[PDB]
Amino acid sequence: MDGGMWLMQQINGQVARMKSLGMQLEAADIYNPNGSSLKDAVVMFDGGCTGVLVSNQGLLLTNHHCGYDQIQKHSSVQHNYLKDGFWSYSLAEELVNPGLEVEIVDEITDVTAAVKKELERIKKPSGLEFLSPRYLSSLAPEIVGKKAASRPGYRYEIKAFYGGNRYYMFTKKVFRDVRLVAAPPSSIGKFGSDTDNWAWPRHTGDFSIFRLYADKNGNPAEYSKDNVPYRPKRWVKVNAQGVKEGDFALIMGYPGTTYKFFTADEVTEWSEIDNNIRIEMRGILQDVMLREMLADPKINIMYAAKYASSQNGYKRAQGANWAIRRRSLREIKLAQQQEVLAWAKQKGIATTEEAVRAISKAIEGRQDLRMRQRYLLEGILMGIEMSNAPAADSDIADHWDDPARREAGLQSIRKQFEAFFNKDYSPEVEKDQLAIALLTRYAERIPAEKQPISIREGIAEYGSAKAYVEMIFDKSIYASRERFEEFMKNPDRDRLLRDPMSRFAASVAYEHQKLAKEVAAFDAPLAAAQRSYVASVLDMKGQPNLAPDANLTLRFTYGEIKGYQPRDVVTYGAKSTLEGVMEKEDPNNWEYVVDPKLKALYEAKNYGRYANSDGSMPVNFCATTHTTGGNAGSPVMNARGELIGLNFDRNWEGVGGDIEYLPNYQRSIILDIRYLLFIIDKFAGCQRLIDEIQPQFHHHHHH
Amino acid sequence: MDGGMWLMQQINGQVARMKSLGMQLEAADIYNPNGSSLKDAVVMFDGGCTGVLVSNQGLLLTNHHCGYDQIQKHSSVQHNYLKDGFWSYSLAEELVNPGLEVEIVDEITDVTAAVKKELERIKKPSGLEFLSPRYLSSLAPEIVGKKAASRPGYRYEIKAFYGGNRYYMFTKKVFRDVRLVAAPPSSIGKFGSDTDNWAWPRHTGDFSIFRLYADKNGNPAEYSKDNVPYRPKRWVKVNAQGVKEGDFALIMGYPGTTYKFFTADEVTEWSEIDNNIRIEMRGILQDVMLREMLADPKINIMYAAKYASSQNGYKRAQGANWAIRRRSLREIKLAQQQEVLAWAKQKGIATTEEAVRAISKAIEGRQDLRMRQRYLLEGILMGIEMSNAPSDIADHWDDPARREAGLQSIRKQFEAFFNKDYSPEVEKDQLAIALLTRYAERIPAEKQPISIREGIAEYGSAKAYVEMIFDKSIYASRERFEEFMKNPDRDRLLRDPMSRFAASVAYEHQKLAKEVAAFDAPLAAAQRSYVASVLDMKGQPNLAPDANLTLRFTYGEIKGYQPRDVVTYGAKSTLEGVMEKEDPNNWEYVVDPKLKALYEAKNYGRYANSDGSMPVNFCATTHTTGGNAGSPVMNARGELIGLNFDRNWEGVGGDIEYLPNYQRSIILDIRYLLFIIDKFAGCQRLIDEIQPQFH
Ligand SMILES: N[C@@H](CC(=O)O)C(=O)O
Ligand SMILES: N[C@@H](CC(=O)O)C(=O)O
Ligand code: NA
């Protein structure tokens, strides 16, 4: 009911208030630098989600939409796991996921002084790199030596906190053999996918299941046929006795990005540029994409993750903008900045007003460039796959006459053609309506002299975006795999250098890097000013009582299970049920199709031990915890640190929580652990997974 | 929350239970055959709405959407009362309304015997007369006698009840000078108009205000400049102390149509024919019309009442079909008919099974006869306005007398067609063609009207046949009409292709009616028989008949509901709910800046709730339907606390089966009405005439 995404180091400062709210854990149970704690079971999944370890054999719970990527990679029309789900009945049946990584925090260390000496010590500093997660983590070898650039299963991550006023280093253990164990069908894992997304009430069985594997010694490893299940330090026990309104809830995970120190001008700019442009372009992309998917099951698999990811950010941006409107978020941030300015004024501090003024100036100044960046990013880089077309390298200059180097150049083109023309790319989807609809709006919004060279010249020569795209596919050697291979049997140097799809990709990448290099003149003073401003906020409040913005590192949040009042006349309860699914069923609406087995279960009320005390079958619940993107898959724990749920979304009003926590409107939306178990047991019949999890049901205990 | 639209005569049978629910009125207070009662203040408005009298000088409250037709008629781009509302500050400023009538029920009498004994010796009956309001009412002279019957200020109404098993007569005092006193702007009067229509929560200030006028001697009269305000026997006192969940609510009004005695098959037919067809046709009409209205201010005014009326039936049909499906209403009615069937079996009554059999058979036989009656109605007769295009040719074309009377009539026939609200520019472009396109798509060319068959055949399309209608007909524009009007030719007048249209449309209409009588006559006869059985089984004093646009009462409590998993709706809405919905770029959620300023300043006076919020709407467990708009909602002591104006979404299925947990009447809090008059319009005179109690 109070917000903030707290550092693991900040547990000592929160533990009293957490206990007063009914928590029955000690601080060292949650985070222990000198031993085992809940931290060890709370896992970063695939770079941008959370997972929780729930058995001594490394079983890993996370969301369906977090596992969505790997589910999609294993799917085909024949074996459509997206549609049908997937269940493994032994370890040998668990699917290998090449490239998939899971990370566990081994150590947390303040490296503020070390990083600052190192940021200093730079002649002619780039605009600003004291915030770059790339550059900062490149400092790790100098901070810890060989133990970094040597130890195979380790990764050192250094990030900026408080706008660059602190640096914390996370020592990570990296698992590179993570196998898919189970997933529900998408009619369960993403029931009401578009319409119910960012919405409470919710009725979505959003989970998937993986397992960490390790080598003969229990260490993280690359995939091997001889790897065995990882046996974790600590795992979380599942409590399946139920939850009620008022219950203390604890969440740990990896929240990605928040903006709690935004000034009023930053709120408006983010709304007017980043969010508006994302909503505009992605709406176009999605109208076309969805139509193509519903009409063809192979296309639907190919573009499933691409579409789900686009839609998710599209609707999030809609939610953020309506939150700013309905909750008056800009006015709140203005009032807060005025408080810190009044604080500084009273203390005789002049820097703070300087910072706020320099922020406004940088925002106002970068307006043209940023809007160009967002249109380029949203309309072309993300939606038009032609951006990834091959391009010639040391063909044509260093060595077209050299047999060895020419073969290497032809090889390079062959290699990036395979990356471009991958199994998820459909030229039909791309050349028919998608690329043309996006480029037509793009060209309308960006004036001709500010468009990438190939696009402006292409539209001038041919009639339009539509004519220019059609020409690109008529003439490019990469329009199809068959044309490509036919050309490669007799490669021509010209034609290779003049390829209009290759020209398109090169002009877009050139403008992307040009926009970046130019906008640095604004983004730099902006970042310096932000550091100054947050430094004042750190003086006013103290560091121990100030939660920093999310930056994809381990955090905890807490609060209680609780519904809310979205609007006049309306009250939303805290807990969802299976009857809510049946109320929504519509065989003719793709997002509300219900699996006949689930319906059969409901009509027979065959819920076994997973039912509520009133006889209804629980599905989701919601809580006053403070989460954001990256917190998907986060374990939700009761007062005793037992697993009662999996976090997977926020309510509509809660999208505003990235800018300001409002206790009456902010809610995490959570998968009831009893629903998860019900789907495993009664729906799928995968009893061995029930056996391995060992859910606690409150029999008396026998010793 | 027991449901039923009770006869006024059935008040004696209901009063005990009503008192059990908190009512502290007597029966005679509500209806009194031999003296003044609440009946005298509850009024039928414009033939199809309700209103209520609230001052001793004949002030009349009704809904905004009931007065919409008159607000629309008086409006123009300058003096735009639809957009800006309208307020009169003296008697003289009140706006005259030619054609608008209001009826007050004077007396109610049982005429069952007399009526039945007169439907005998109708040599060779059509089989449809005994349900006909006009035929039945045309029987009234020989019931009451020529003298009381020919009275200028009275009208006699006779309608069938219980499917034709009872007949009651209503004597109406009829007022033909009803003047507009006040209306809020449409941003208040239908806030959230399409999206929030048929929906709770609701935040709509749905009212308008009229006044009844009379002559020197205080009696009903035609308009005349010398008319004075009518002084009612009784009028309803307004209570402004507020309401809360659980309060008793009484409603009186004129519910139009319900179908509580439908068999299963009738539920099925009504759904898949009437509603399905209304929905698809009105969907296409609405799309076109709204885009036109929104793109041009003047069009928006001309077509405002047409669009709103259409959209309201369109969404109602959506709601009705949604109820049929989600409450399995067919199976519920099936269960009910099987309880009366089993009842008949244990009595040895063969009547009922044959009736249910005959209903099924008639529904079966009239399928595409009636399936076509509706496409014609929805697609053409109501959508396409050239359906009313115009001695004378033959009989006296050469005679300067009946060739001098003929075409002037065709000018009174043309003025009615090309009227103040008709825009030929909208028709061609998309309207008439989009409708006819779909029409022809779904009616075999063989079955279409003889004019329509001809030209999709000749010309490439319906699009081009309409294109030919305007290019080659005299009535396509007023300029073209008055030009070849000094030049009356007797060859291209019968050959006018827009006239050829209206004639065949109207012909194919009547032939369907004639063809359907062979199925509708047995259907009606069989329904009568069924409902007679239901009447035998249940008591008549305890069975409420279907609505039939006569005066009824319903009662219940102020109460919200739980529409779906996780969700609870409260019983009362507030002004904050308006402000939460505001969107300057969405026409239906536009908020007047004076209303928002009142909200920002909390300038509510004695009209606010106790918690300081400003009430707007509330909802109740009463049983209402189309025709109850503008009905007075009264408290335990017969005092006015609201005006009914809608149902919630689940409530639409209430015309087939009443569901206590879901069915709600959506009601204008009378304090919101007062607040808009007082704080928003500053029309203090109306607040003085009304005189709210705050006790
Ligand atoms: N659904 C988000 C979580 C959130 O935005 O609250 C995610 O995938 O991490
Ligand atoms: N809105 C309707 C009332 C209802 O159908 O409940 C009317 O005009 O009478
Ligand atoms: Na500062």
Residue numbers in the entry:
A (entry chain A): 21 to 723
B (entry chain B): 21 to 410, 414 to 718
Sentences from the paper on this structure:
Here, we show that dipeptidyl peptidase 11 (DPP11), a central metabolic enzyme in these bacteria, undergoes a conformational change upon peptide binding to distinguish substrates from end products. As previously reported, the overall fold of DPP11 comprises a bilobal architecture. The upper helical domain dictates the specificity of the enzyme and caps the catalytic domain, which has a typical chymotrypsin double β-barrel fold. The active site of DPP11 lays in a wide cleft running through the middle of the protein between the catalytic and helical domains, which contributes to the formation of the substrate binding subsites.
We determined the structures for the inactive constructs PgDPP1122-720 S655A, PeDPP1122-717 S652A and its complexes with the dipeptides Arg-Asp and Arg-Glu, as well as the substrate Leu-Asp-Val-Trp, at 2.4, 2.85, 2.2, 2.1 and 2.6 Å resolution, referred to as PgDPP11, PeDPP11, PeDPP11:RD, PeDPP11:RE and PeDPP11:LDVWs, respectively. A notable difference between the unbound PeDPP11 and its complexes with peptides is the conformational change bringing the helical and catalytic domains closer. This movement yields an approximate rotation of 22° of one domain relative to the other with a negligible translational component. The bound-peptide is anchored at its N-terminus primarily by N332 (N-anchor) located in the helical domain. The distance between the N-anchor and the catalytic S652 permits accommodation of only two amino acid residues, revealing how the enzyme acquires its dipeptidyl peptidase specificity. Evolutionary conserved R670 is responsible for the Asp/Glu specificity at subsite S1: its guanidinium group directly interacts with the substrate carboxyl group of Asp/Glu. Analysis of PeDPP11:RD using Naccess32 revealed a large loss of solvent-accessible area upon peptide binding, approximately 1430 Å2. However, our crystal structures of DPP11 in complex with LDVW and dipeptide RD are both in closed conformation, excluding the possibility that solvent released from the protein’s cleft would explain the larger increase in entropy upon substrate binding.
